[PDB]
Design a protein around this ligand. Structure first.
Ligand SMILES: [Mg+2]
Ligand SMILES: [Mg+2]
Ligand SMILES: [Mg+2]
Ligand SMILES: [Mg+2]
Ligand SMILES: [Mg+2]
Ligand SMILES: [Mg+2]
Ligand SMILES: [Mg+2]
Ligand SMILES: [Mg+2]
Ligand SMILES: [Mg+2]
Ligand SMILES: [Mg+2]
Ligand SMILES: [Mg+2]
Ligand SMILES: [Mg+2]
Ligand SMILES: [Mg+2]
Ligand SMILES: [Mg+2]
Ligand SMILES: [Mg+2]
Ligand SMILES: [Mg+2]
Lengths: 205, 156, 80, 82, 129, 46, 123
RNA sequence: UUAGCUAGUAGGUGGGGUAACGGCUCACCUAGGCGACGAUCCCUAGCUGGUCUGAGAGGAUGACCAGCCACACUGGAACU
RNA sequence: UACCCGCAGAAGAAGCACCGGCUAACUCCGUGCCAGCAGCCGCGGUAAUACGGAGGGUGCAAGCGUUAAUCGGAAUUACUGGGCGUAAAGCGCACGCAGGCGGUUUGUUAAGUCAGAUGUGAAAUCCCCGGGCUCAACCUGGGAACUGCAUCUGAUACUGG
């Protein structure tokens, strides 16, 4: 259910930084981010119309760490729901418990957050939730349980988050180790580099 | 400000006493991402020169299209040669649902939300022309009000 | 008030009995065309009052024979 | 005869009982005249487990319908609650 | 033989629009007249004029805006070979509400929008864009 | 190994000769890369 | 084209037969090799294509291609055929399944093994 | 590239029979009845709610679940 | 039993297809119209990104491929939604029964048509707002829908009588 291989490779393939590593060390020092992975990295072939969309889709999938069938399901759900489809999909992706945790700053990477979720560290409304794909609702408090509160990794993650830009749609407490999912995030709150529309188009043929 | 992209480049032949002389035909389309749309069809012995020619052609002979909030105003048919085209406006978030050359021309135009289909022949040059024709013919509410001698609120 | 149908008498040869074609104006399920369809029915008539090509109002009843579950109520336009 | 009885309509180890008026000979989950409410034995706190359209049940009884024991118990419970 | 007068009228109108003719004339009918009136109301023609007693002739003054024809497209929907009847909820929208659909309703010949407002359907005579 | 099913039916006199007059030992003519029958509509990788 | 005409006599749908008729809507069928032989393909291809005439479970007598480099097949060899026509070979509409029934997997393959019935090289 | 089919056949009168109407059956009388809006014959097929696909209209389909039908080694027959 | 707590240690747990174009992903060696590949086009005859191996990559993932099967694309039976001078397609020409269609005015009828209502259109399924299994799948409350048919009361512009 997870990708287990090299993480920076994926980023290289994409072109952009996907936040796949914590960010203590800069991405440019740790890998050749501009060069594609493999023997034929130096060559940059001209990509087809289908191709670019596919790449974009992969980028988004990589970002969240979501496998294809689940992604398809998410897309379908977005389509079903009223309003903007790509936007809806993005919102759904955000809703993911692990992603929420990452945003809050309990996980240094999203992978770390996912791990935490798996290992029973995370409580949603005073209930220990184990699934990363759990859709967090508005006005839902999500906290670290007292067993996992003594973890040094968690504090490091928090510190890292403090350095990074904080989300408007969340309110997080460092000392209490709890966060409030205020509202489902808007498109303007999220990154502009993501071209959701291409992804939408892709799943229409 | 002007976004420009090549649709299709094809090698064409002229036959002579010696053998065949090969030329390249490049079909490009330009748009400002608002109302203006223009296609270009350039031809040279080399590809890049041909593409340049096409671009030049596209830059002149442009056509203004009435767009409502980044989409079409009404369902519209467009015809040229064998290529008979249909395109329909859609709710925001649906994306550009169009095939081949069509997709390109819509993107440069600045439409973001369409459901479109090409019937009959699907020859790139013809189909793009058809699409452009369709775009041209499509009128706005204001325009129709002007034509009928009425207000926009009376027609809705 | 009673359920009843109208039609032309196609044949009146058999004793106490008439066959009455009923023209129904149905729409086609696929094509949308309105087509004249025919419903042939074996009708009971006492006294043998009916002629050929006669318009007749008929009602459904308990079956009187193998094919005959309909009886006439009134005869209209008995022109020859 | 006409009877008022439960039809098990749930998941494995999670039953949900649809109270139905039916001809007794019919299969439990099969043909029925009228569905006159529901009962959920696995229902949590802060939700209605049992809800029965009592008037219809009464009508059926009047007509001459037998009541299943469990259904009767449910009815009694409802009466107590009200 | 002439089997559809309304259709013929529409064709005539179309031809006039094409050929830049100021006025189009035809043998008058009641339904035709109603249609003309509807068009006038909607503003696709300038004026309509019935003239004659024994055999009256409807004369339509065509409308042109900025050198070009006002009536862009004009197509019959119901026809003698294939009749078309729609319900109030089933009523179509020409040019996404911009163009009009002439509908013969229980309460007289009117535009589609008017029919919708009323709350009744009927025979859709033609689409006009 | 597998037997070749020749299109000669029942060989009577000489087998080798029969085989020679069969699709098996047909002439193999190269398609020109340059010259006469040399024109390719689309390349191997185009 | 006229609606009345259509009403009178409706549009006949294109009755399309299957190109694999001896399989009889079955994914695979078992058969016995009546003979195994090589054949020359049609122009412009030059080869000696391995193929077998098969008396099938359901009474049909067909010919089926043998994919891969080298095979153990011979007369009276109980094999599974899967369908898929060979463009070069005249009258060949079927592929034998490598790694099923009497048919062996291809020797020394490390890629696309699924298609050729080759087991994982354990190391 | 199945055009004619049908004598209990179509109808009537009277008896008999059915829980019940009825050629359901019998006696006699009439000569009908169905059929190009496809009778008859031949090939295939359980039917539906539905399922799959599709923008839709349609096309294909009828496992599971539910309703209806038919069958219970094959062909008949009745009794309770 | 679900569920919860404790114990130890990264521990017991990743493959399958593909990489000529369509179609995301390229090179080297081996072979030399041979062996072989292939859905189509076609590839291979000594520098093969198309065969086989390797390295590298791409796509899926406890699955991944192949085959069969249906719909889709395929407006390629076109009701929506195609055509017929020359691409497939106007009977050799006429008359004409059945059939289809039918100028205009008034009246009437209310069959077609439209409107409203009543009864039904089983439940499940599909869809919407919810609730319950840690999430989901799944189960489920209420709705909507089931485009239909029948009956009653009206409307009468159009089609019919
Ligand atoms: Mg949506
Ligand atoms: Mg010269
Ligand atoms: Mg209890
Ligand atoms: Mg059978
Ligand atoms: Mg379609
Ligand atoms: Mg047995
Ligand atoms: Mg590629
Ligand atoms: Mg080599
Ligand atoms: Mg390939
Ligand atoms: Mg290879
Ligand atoms: Mg089709
Ligand atoms: Mg055609
Ligand atoms: Mg011809
Ligand atoms: Mg002629
Ligand atoms: Mg008339
Ligand atoms: Mg009249």
């Amino acid at each position: 259910a997870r990708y287990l291989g090299p993480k920076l490779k994926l980023s290289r393939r994409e072109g952009t930084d996907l936040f796949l590593k914590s960010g203590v060390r800069a991405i440019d020092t740790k890998c050749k981010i501009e060069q594609a992975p493999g023997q034929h990295g130096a060559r940059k072939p001209r990509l087809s119309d289908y191709g670019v969309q596919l790449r974009e889709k992969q980028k988004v999938r990589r970002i969240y760490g979501v496998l294809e069938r689940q992604f398809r399901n998410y897309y379908k759900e977005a389509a079903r729901l009223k309003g903007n489809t790509g936007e809806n999909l993005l919102a759904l992706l955000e809703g993911r418990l692990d992603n929420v945790v990452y945003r809050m700053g309990f996980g240094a990477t999203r992978a770390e957050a996912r791990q935490l979720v798996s290992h029973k560290a995370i409580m949603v409304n005073g209930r220990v939730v184990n699934i990363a794909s759990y859709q967090v609702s508005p006005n839902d408090v999500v906290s670290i349980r007292e067993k996992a509160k003594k973890q040094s990794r968690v504090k490091a993650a928090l510190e890292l988050a403090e350095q990074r830009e904080k989300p408007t749609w969340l309110e997080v407490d460092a000392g209490k180790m709890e966060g409030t999912f205020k509202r489902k995030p808007e498109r303007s709150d999220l990154s502009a580099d993501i071209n959701e529309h291409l992804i939408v188009e892709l799943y229409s043929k | 400000e002007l976004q420009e992209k090549l649709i299709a480049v094809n090698r064409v032949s002229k036959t002579v006493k010696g053998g065949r002389i090969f030329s390249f035909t490049a079909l490009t389309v330009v748009g400002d991402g608002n109302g203006r749309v223009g296609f270009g069809y350039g031809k040279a012995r080399e590809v890049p020169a041909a593409i340049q020619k096409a671009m030049e052609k596209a830059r002149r002979n442009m056509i203004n299209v009435a767009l409502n909030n980044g989409t079409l105003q009404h369902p519209v048919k467009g015809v040229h040669t064998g290529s008979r085209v249909f395109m329909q406006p859609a709710s925001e978030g649906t994306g550009i649902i169009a095939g081949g050359a069509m997709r390109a021309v819509l993107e440069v135009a600045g439409v973001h939300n369409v459901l479109a289909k090409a019937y009959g022949s699907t020859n790139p040059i013809n189909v793009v022309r058809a699409t452009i024709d369709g775009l041209e013919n499509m009128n706005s509410p204001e325009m129709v009000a002007a034509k009928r001698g009425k207000s926009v609120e009376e027609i809705l | 008030k009673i359920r009843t149908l109208q039609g032309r008498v196609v044949s009146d040869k058999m004793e106490k009995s008439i066959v009455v074609a009923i023209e129904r104006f149905v729409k086609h399920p696929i094509y949308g065309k309105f087509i004249k369809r025919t419903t042939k029915l074996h009708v009971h008539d006492e006294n043998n009052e009916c002629g050929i090509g006669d318009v007749v109002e008929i009602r459904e009843c308990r079956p009187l024979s193998k094919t005959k579950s309909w009886t006439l109520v009134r005869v209209v336009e008995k022109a020859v | 005869m006409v009877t008022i009885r439960l039809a098990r309509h749930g998941a494995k180890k999670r039953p949900f009982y649809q109270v139905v008026v039916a001809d007794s000979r019919n299969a439990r989950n099969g043909r029925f005249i009228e569905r006159v409410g529901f009962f959920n034995p696995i229902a949590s706190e802060k939700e209605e487990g049992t809800r029965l359209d009592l008037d219809r049940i009464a009508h059926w009884v009047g007509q001459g319908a037998t009541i299943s024991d469990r259904v009767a118990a449910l009815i009694k419970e409802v009466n107590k609650a009200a | 033989s002439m089997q559809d007068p309304i259709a013929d009228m529409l064709t005539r109108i179309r031809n006039g629009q094409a050929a830049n003719k100021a006025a189009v004339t035809m043998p008058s009918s009641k339904l035709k007249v109603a249609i003309a009136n509807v068009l006038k109301e909607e503003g696709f023609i300038e004026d309509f004029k019935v003239e004659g007693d024994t055999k009256p002739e409807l004369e339509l003054t065509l409308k042109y805006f900025q050198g070009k024809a006002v009536v862009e497209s004009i197509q019959r929907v119901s026809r003698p070979g294939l009749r078309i009847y729609k319900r109030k909820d089933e009523l179509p929208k020409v040019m996404a509400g911009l163009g009009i659909a002439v509908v013969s309703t229980s309460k007289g010949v009117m535009t589609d929008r008017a029919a919708r407002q009323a709350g009744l359907g009927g025979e859709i005579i033609c689409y006009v864009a | 190994m597998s037997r070749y099913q020749h299109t000669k039916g029942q060989i009577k006199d000489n087998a080798i000769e029969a085989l020679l007059h069969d699709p098996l030992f047909r002439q193999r003519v190269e398609k020109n890369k340059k010259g006469k029958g040399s024109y390719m509509r689309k390349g191997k990788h185009g | 084209a006229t609606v009345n005409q259509l009403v009178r006599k409706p549009r006949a749908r294109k009755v399309a037969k299957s190109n694999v008729p001896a399989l009889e809507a079955c994914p695979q069928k078992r058969g016995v090799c009546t003979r195994v032989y090589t054949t020359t393909p049609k122009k412009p291809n030059s080869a000696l294509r391995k193929v077998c005439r098969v008396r099938l479970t359901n009474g049909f007598e067909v010919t089926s291609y043998i994919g891969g480099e080298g095979h153990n097949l011979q007369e009276h060899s109980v094999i599974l055929i899967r369908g898929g026509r060979v463009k070069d070979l005249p009258g060949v509409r079927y592929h034998t399944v490598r790694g099923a029934l009497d048919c062996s997997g291809v020797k020394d393959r490390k890629q696309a093994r699924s298609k050729y019935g080759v087991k994982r090289p354990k190391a």
